[PDB]
């Protein structure tokens, strides 16, 4: 037992990371089959990034202006295109390490593993969630652009995120692998409003179920509540309203623990109204919302890839 | 910027994990060059584990009693030995994926990445620390035995931990790759005292430096203190006493931020005496001690492997 914030094994993705250089800018790319994906602002100089005309900038560029390197291996670029906010560089070689993979656009509240890279080399891996306002709270220094987020379901890598920017507020924004930004964000250096964030209520409930499974039970009540009564308190405290879809998803954890979902909601209500009294739950002094119900089940099931 | 608990990329280690089965028990092994390392209690049945005579049990075993499988590949066992609390199985093949590697025995307070495995397949990766009492707070379900902890310094994998047991108290215990347990623990199913844990003071100071680097500054004081005065408060609150060796190690962070180490100690003192007032530091409502000074520098430097 025990419960930890746990990233997927990153081997399959390590073998897809390359370095992409264009003019002066170098960032990371994702080499799958015979295509390399990377943020399109690799073609920006530090003067352009206030309001770049990407079409006009890409037009000054030809295949040989893009340097793609896989470790020491140089790749030959035989085609280039812009799809939304990503560049797709066609290379004459297929990545011999290409995993089985999908491109997916995740929903707010879902989680994924991030492999932070610089100059095409992996530096570390960590788990995070797509916030309800479509930002993520990551660790992304300059040059981490092109780092990708992913999930793995037995041998299949579902890529869901590519890092593009840090906002002036210190949070992060990026696209799906088709180049569409999560959220209202654009790839230019300006002040951009992320908007009010909220807490992923269903994830907090999964984490409280994770805690009961692992012995932390001090927060269980002699009380219950109603979906609508609880949502009243969710509103006051900026929690996502809970729905019947969420209740269903928590079914498996309700059945493993024998604690009705609404009873668990009643425990959450009291934790929101009375704080935690300097106590801890799974080693945390606040309510953690970056575990999906699927995440919790994975850890307690021991699923492998 | 941003600061996250970050594991090393696990690719190099994924390619070394194998399944080891002996009689009925199956757990994970580490296949390096032409040797497979695994916990010696793979030769225990569920009756033996109260007080097993490992020599007598190993004597009933021959090479062909050990089944080693690397994915689908079966390995031929041509030799077996017991070194402290690990088995070393000689196989007729060298792992073509063996990285450059060392076996190292870490000190309490240092960190490492854990690749949790079941049946020889990787399930996830996370960072943790060797507690001062020589336990770790991990996520280890049954069959995770043989999972290994490691560090990576540009291409070199320093293996430092192999998982053996969960203690009745829910914490975890294991050995170095020479089979010597960290701490006073033995591989039998009995109640074992871990002993008073303490907080890794130097790590907390590194994390406060990480917070200043990333904008969280509300905890900085108009006060300073002395090494001996601060250690008085460390004692009361079960913090490791701070030494001049620790002060030196924090030098680089002292210089990057312009905050003298003893001034930072003064901030820690006040946080220990007055709590955090329902505020947060790098998203945490308690004092985090699982980042070494080296860890913090790595994240803010962007080191790659
Ligand atoms: C990955 C981020 C990074 O490395 N940097 C230097 C920030 C940048 N932001 C832009 C954008 F989106 F404003 F055009 C281009 S580079
Ligand atoms: C890795 C732990 C695990 O999977 N289990 C079932 C607990 C075990 N503990 C023992 C020991 F050390 F007491 F002999 C043998 S198996």
Short mmCIF file of C-alpha atoms in Angstrom, two decimals, chain A:
data_model
loop_
_atom_site.label_atom_id
_atom_site.label_comp_id
_atom_site.label_asym_id
_atom_site.label_seq_id
_atom_site.Cartn_x
_atom_site.Cartn_y
_atom_site.Cartn_z
CA UNK A 1 0.00 0.00 0.00
CA UNK A 2 0.87 3.68 0.12
CA UNK A 3 -0.26 6.42 -2.25
CA UNK A 4 2.02 8.57 -4.40
CA UNK A 5 1.64 10.99 -7.28
CA UNK A 6 2.97 8.69 -9.97
CA UNK A 7 3.93 9.31 -13.59
CA UNK A 8 3.83 6.70 -16.32
CA UNK A 9 7.10 5.00 -17.31
CA UNK A 10 8.67 7.36 -19.83
CA UNK A 11 10.76 4.95 -21.90
CA UNK A 12 8.46 4.83 -24.91
CA UNK A 13 8.38 8.63 -25.08
CA UNK A 14 12.10 9.18 -24.43
CA UNK A 15 12.80 7.46 -27.75
CA UNK A 16 10.62 9.99 -29.61
CA UNK A 17 12.17 13.25 -28.38
CA UNK A 18 14.34 15.18 -30.84
CA UNK A 19 15.91 18.63 -31.03
CA UNK A 20 14.45 21.11 -33.51
CA UNK A 21 16.42 24.24 -34.41
CA UNK A 22 15.30 26.99 -36.78
CA UNK A 23 17.42 30.08 -37.21
CA UNK A 24 18.45 30.72 -33.60
CA UNK A 25 15.66 29.03 -31.65
CA UNK A 26 16.07 25.46 -30.40
CA UNK A 27 13.29 23.48 -28.74
CA UNK A 28 12.08 19.89 -28.52
CA UNK A 29 10.12 17.91 -31.06
CA UNK A 30 8.20 14.63 -31.15
CA UNK A 31 9.34 12.19 -33.85
CA UNK A 32 6.61 9.67 -34.69
CA UNK A 33 6.73 7.52 -37.82
CA UNK A 34 8.26 9.86 -40.44
CA UNK A 35 6.98 13.16 -38.98
CA UNK A 36 8.36 15.52 -36.33
CA UNK A 37 5.92 17.69 -34.37
CA UNK A 38 7.04 20.83 -32.54
CA UNK A 39 5.68 24.25 -31.55
CA UNK A 40 5.47 26.64 -34.47
CA UNK A 41 7.07 29.48 -32.50
CA UNK A 42 10.44 27.85 -33.16
CA UNK A 43 10.41 30.10 -36.25
CA UNK A 44 10.11 33.23 -34.09
CA UNK A 45 12.96 35.51 -33.10
CA UNK A 46 12.71 37.35 -29.79
CA UNK A 47 11.40 40.43 -31.61
CA UNK A 48 8.55 38.55 -33.32
CA UNK A 49 6.93 37.07 -30.22
CA UNK A 50 4.87 40.19 -29.38
CA UNK A 51 2.58 39.63 -32.39
CA UNK A 52 4.04 37.25 -35.00
CA UNK A 53 2.57 36.73 -38.47
CA UNK A 54 3.24 33.01 -38.54
CA UNK A 55 2.21 32.50 -42.18
CA UNK A 56 4.57 35.25 -43.35
CA UNK A 57 7.37 33.92 -41.14
CA UNK A 58 6.92 30.32 -42.27
CA UNK A 59 7.04 31.49 -45.90
CA UNK A 60 10.60 32.77 -45.49
CA UNK A 61 11.53 29.24 -44.37
CA UNK A 62 12.45 26.19 -46.44
CA UNK A 63 13.03 22.55 -45.53
CA UNK A 64 16.78 22.99 -45.03
CA UNK A 65 16.18 25.82 -42.54
CA UNK A 66 14.95 23.23 -40.01
CA UNK A 67 17.64 21.26 -38.18
CA UNK A 68 16.33 18.06 -36.58
CA UNK A 69 18.69 15.93 -34.49
CA UNK A 70 17.91 12.70 -32.62
CA UNK A 71 20.74 12.41 -30.13
CA UNK A 72 23.61 12.55 -32.61
CA UNK A 73 21.54 11.42 -35.61
CA UNK A 74 20.68 14.22 -38.03
CA UNK A 75 17.35 13.85 -39.83
CA UNK A 76 16.68 14.95 -43.41
CA UNK A 77 13.68 17.28 -43.70
CA UNK A 78 11.73 16.71 -46.92
CA UNK A 79 8.53 18.61 -46.16
CA UNK A 80 7.05 21.14 -43.74
CA UNK A 81 3.58 22.39 -42.91
CA UNK A 82 1.74 24.36 -40.24
CA UNK A 83 -1.30 22.77 -38.57
CA UNK A 84 -2.90 25.25 -36.17
CA UNK A 85 -0.11 26.09 -33.70
CA UNK A 86 2.30 23.22 -34.47
CA UNK A 87 4.79 22.53 -37.24
CA UNK A 88 4.76 19.12 -38.91
CA UNK A 89 8.18 18.37 -40.41
CA UNK A 90 8.33 15.41 -42.80
CA UNK A 91 11.63 13.54 -42.50
CA UNK A 92 13.04 10.89 -44.81
CA UNK A 93 13.27 8.32 -41.99
CA UNK A 94 10.69 6.61 -39.80
CA UNK A 95 11.51 6.63 -36.11
CA UNK A 96 12.45 2.96 -35.45
CA UNK A 97 11.30 3.55 -31.86
CA UNK A 98 7.81 4.84 -32.69
CA UNK A 99 5.37 3.31 -30.17
CA UNK A 100 1.78 2.49 -30.91
CA UNK A 101 0.13 5.83 -30.27
CA UNK A 102 -2.93 8.05 -30.57
CA UNK A 103 -3.44 11.80 -30.52
CA UNK A 104 -6.19 12.67 -28.04
CA UNK A 105 -7.57 15.93 -26.67
CA UNK A 106 -8.18 15.48 -22.95
CA UNK A 107 -10.96 17.05 -20.92
CA UNK A 108 -10.35 19.46 -18.03
CA UNK A 109 -9.80 17.48 -14.85
CA UNK A 110 -8.04 14.53 -16.49
CA UNK A 111 -4.39 13.80 -15.70
CA UNK A 112 -1.30 12.98 -17.74
CA UNK A 113 2.44 12.45 -17.38
CA UNK A 114 4.84 15.20 -18.49
CA UNK A 115 8.36 14.42 -19.74
CA UNK A 116 10.19 17.74 -19.43
CA UNK A 117 12.95 18.05 -22.02
CA UNK A 118 15.66 20.51 -23.03
CA UNK A 119 17.58 20.41 -26.31
CA UNK A 120 15.80 17.14 -27.07
CA UNK A 121 17.09 15.36 -23.96
CA UNK A 122 14.79 14.14 -21.16
CA UNK A 123 15.36 15.70 -17.73
CA UNK A 124 12.48 14.35 -15.61
CA UNK A 125 8.91 13.12 -15.44
CA UNK A 126 5.94 14.15 -13.31
CA UNK A 127 2.15 13.92 -13.19
CA UNK A 128 -0.22 16.85 -13.53
CA UNK A 129 -3.80 17.71 -14.46
CA UNK A 130 -5.53 19.87 -17.04
CA UNK A 131 -7.01 22.52 -14.76
CA UNK A 132 -10.66 23.49 -15.33
CA UNK A 133 -9.40 26.77 -16.82
CA UNK A 134 -7.17 24.81 -19.25
CA UNK A 135 -3.78 25.63 -17.71
CA UNK A 136 -1.38 23.24 -16.00
CA UNK A 137 0.90 23.76 -12.99
CA UNK A 138 4.13 22.26 -14.27
CA UNK A 139 7.90 22.78 -14.15
CA UNK A 140 8.94 24.28 -17.50
CA UNK A 141 12.11 26.33 -17.88
CA UNK A 142 12.98 28.12 -21.11
CA UNK A 143 13.64 25.63 -23.87
CA UNK A 144 11.14 23.13 -22.45
CA UNK A 145 8.80 24.02 -25.34
CA UNK A 146 7.90 20.91 -27.28
CA UNK A 147 7.82 18.80 -24.14
CA UNK A 148 4.79 16.54 -24.34
CA UNK A 149 2.24 15.09 -21.94
CA UNK A 150 0.86 11.61 -22.35
CA UNK A 151 -1.00 8.64 -20.94
CA UNK A 152 -0.22 4.95 -21.46
CA UNK A 153 -2.78 2.13 -21.64
CA UNK A 154 -0.88 -1.16 -21.96
CA UNK A 155 1.59 -0.40 -24.81
CA UNK A 156 -0.41 2.46 -26.35
CA UNK A 157 0.77 6.04 -25.82
CA UNK A 158 -2.03 8.62 -25.94
CA UNK A 159 -0.31 11.97 -26.48
CA UNK A 160 -2.50 14.78 -25.19
CA UNK A 161 -0.33 17.87 -24.59
CA UNK A 162 2.59 19.82 -26.04
CA UNK A 163 4.09 22.66 -24.03
CA UNK A 164 4.18 26.12 -25.61
CA UNK A 165 4.27 28.94 -23.09
CA UNK A 166 4.53 30.09 -19.50
CA UNK A 167 1.95 32.77 -18.73
CA UNK A 168 2.97 35.97 -16.90
CA UNK A 169 1.22 34.43 -13.88
CA UNK A 170 3.60 31.46 -13.71
CA UNK A 171 1.19 28.81 -15.01
CA UNK A 172 1.54 26.94 -18.28
CA UNK A 173 -0.35 26.60 -21.54
CA UNK A 174 -0.06 24.37 -24.56
CA UNK A 175 -1.82 22.52 -27.34
CA UNK A 176 -3.05 19.11 -28.32
CA UNK A 177 -0.96 17.33 -30.94
CA UNK A 178 -3.13 18.83 -33.70
CA UNK A 179 -1.95 22.27 -32.59
CA UNK A 180 -5.17 23.51 -30.98
CA UNK A 181 -4.58 25.32 -27.71
CA UNK A 182 -6.27 24.12 -24.58
CA UNK A 183 -8.08 27.23 -23.39
CA UNK A 184 -8.32 30.74 -24.85
CA UNK A 185 -4.58 31.12 -25.33
CA UNK A 186 -2.53 32.17 -28.35
CA UNK A 187 1.20 31.79 -29.04
CA UNK A 188 2.35 35.38 -28.61
CA UNK A 189 3.98 37.18 -25.68
CA UNK A 190 1.12 39.17 -24.16
CA UNK A 191 -0.89 39.28 -20.95
CA UNK A 192 -3.57 36.59 -21.25
CA UNK A 193 -6.34 35.91 -18.75
CA UNK A 194 -6.57 32.26 -17.72
CA UNK A 195 -9.80 32.91 -15.84
CA UNK A 196 -11.15 31.68 -12.52
CA UNK A 197 -9.91 28.21 -11.73
CA UNK A 198 -11.97 25.78 -9.68
CA UNK A 199 -11.27 22.57 -7.80
CA UNK A 200 -11.93 19.24 -9.53
CA UNK A 201 -14.49 17.93 -7.06
CA UNK A 202 -14.65 14.36 -8.38
CA UNK A 203 -10.86 14.05 -8.11
CA UNK A 204 -10.91 15.18 -4.47
CA UNK A 205 -13.51 12.50 -3.72
CA UNK A 206 -11.36 9.85 -5.41
CA UNK A 207 -8.40 10.94 -3.27
CA UNK A 208 -10.48 10.68 -0.10
CA UNK A 209 -11.37 7.14 -1.20
CA UNK A 210 -7.65 6.53 -1.75
CA UNK A 211 -7.08 7.70 1.82
CA UNK A 212 -9.67 5.36 3.35
CA UNK A 213 -8.13 2.47 1.40
CA UNK A 214 -4.77 3.30 3.00
CA UNK A 215 -5.90 3.80 6.61
CA UNK A 216 -6.51 7.55 6.87
CA UNK A 217 -10.12 7.57 8.09
CA UNK A 218 -10.32 10.39 10.66
CA UNK A 219 -12.41 12.48 8.24
CA UNK A 220 -15.37 10.07 7.98
CA UNK A 221 -18.64 11.49 9.31
CA UNK A 222 -21.82 10.49 11.08
CA UNK A 223 -23.48 12.65 8.39
CA UNK A 224 -24.72 12.36 4.82
CA UNK A 225 -25.96 14.94 2.32
CA UNK A 226 -27.68 15.44 -1.03
CA UNK A 227 -26.21 16.12 -4.46
CA UNK A 228 -27.89 19.53 -4.51
CA UNK A 229 -27.08 20.44 -0.90
CA UNK A 230 -23.42 19.54 -1.44
CA UNK A 231 -23.26 21.55 -4.67
CA UNK A 232 -24.44 24.56 -2.66
CA UNK A 233 -21.22 24.29 -0.65
CA UNK A 234 -19.20 23.51 -3.79
CA UNK A 235 -20.28 26.88 -5.19
CA UNK A 236 -19.25 28.86 -2.10
CA UNK A 237 -15.80 27.22 -2.08
CA UNK A 238 -15.19 27.29 -5.87
CA UNK A 239 -15.51 23.54 -6.37
CA UNK A 240 -16.78 22.12 -9.63
CA UNK A 241 -20.45 21.15 -9.21
CA UNK A 242 -20.88 17.40 -8.78
CA UNK A 243 -23.09 15.48 -11.20
CA UNK A 244 -24.53 11.99 -11.56
CA UNK A 245 -21.83 11.21 -14.12
CA UNK A 246 -19.25 11.86 -11.40
CA UNK A 247 -21.17 9.73 -8.89
CA UNK A 248 -21.19 6.84 -11.37
CA UNK A 249 -17.45 7.12 -12.01
CA UNK A 250 -16.85 6.82 -8.25
CA UNK A 251 -18.93 3.62 -8.12
CA UNK A 252 -16.01 1.18 -8.11
CA UNK A 253 -14.42 3.05 -5.19
CA UNK A 254 -17.79 3.24 -3.43
CA UNK A 255 -18.05 -0.55 -3.73
CA UNK A 256 -14.47 -1.35 -2.69
CA UNK A 257 -14.77 0.75 0.48
CA UNK A 258 -18.45 0.36 1.34
CA UNK A 259 -18.84 4.14 1.70
CA UNK A 260 -21.71 5.67 -0.26
CA UNK A 261 -20.62 8.54 -2.49
CA UNK A 262 -22.98 11.02 -0.85
CA UNK A 263 -21.61 10.04 2.56
CA UNK A 264 -18.14 10.86 1.23
CA UNK A 265 -19.51 14.17 -0.07
CA UNK A 266 -20.70 14.78 3.49
CA UNK A 267 -17.14 14.28 4.72
CA UNK A 268 -15.86 16.70 2.07
CA UNK A 269 -18.46 19.28 3.09
CA UNK A 270 -17.24 19.26 6.69
CA UNK A 271 -13.58 19.45 5.62
CA UNK A 272 -14.47 22.50 3.51
CA UNK A 273 -16.42 24.20 6.31
CA UNK A 274 -14.05 23.37 9.19
CA UNK A 275 -10.67 22.96 7.55
CA UNK A 276 -8.45 20.07 8.59
CA UNK A 277 -7.51 21.19 12.14
CA UNK A 278 -3.80 20.80 11.50
CA UNK A 279 -4.30 17.11 10.72
CA UNK A 280 -3.17 15.44 7.49
CA UNK A 281 -4.63 13.12 4.85
CA UNK A 282 -2.15 10.93 2.96
CA UNK A 283 0.61 13.28 4.07
CA UNK A 284 -1.04 16.45 2.76
CA UNK A 285 -2.44 19.37 4.76
CA UNK A 286 -4.81 20.44 1.97
CA UNK A 287 -7.36 18.78 -0.30
CA UNK A 288 -5.60 17.23 -3.30
CA UNK A 289 -7.46 17.25 -6.61
CA UNK A 290 -4.93 15.87 -9.13
CA UNK A 291 -5.98 12.20 -8.89
CA UNK A 292 -8.75 11.00 -11.16
CA UNK A 293 -10.94 8.08 -10.06
CA UNK A 294 -9.10 6.10 -12.74
CA UNK A 295 -5.77 7.16 -11.23
CA UNK A 296 -6.71 5.87 -7.77
CA UNK A 297 -7.91 2.52 -9.11
CA UNK A 298 -4.69 2.07 -11.10
CA UNK A 299 -2.48 2.47 -8.04
CA UNK A 300 -4.52 0.10 -5.86
CA UNK A 301 -4.86 -2.41 -8.73
CA UNK A 302 -1.21 -2.33 -9.80
CA UNK A 303 -1.83 -2.02 -13.54
CA UNK A 304 1.22 -2.43 -15.78
CA UNK A 305 2.14 -1.46 -19.33
#
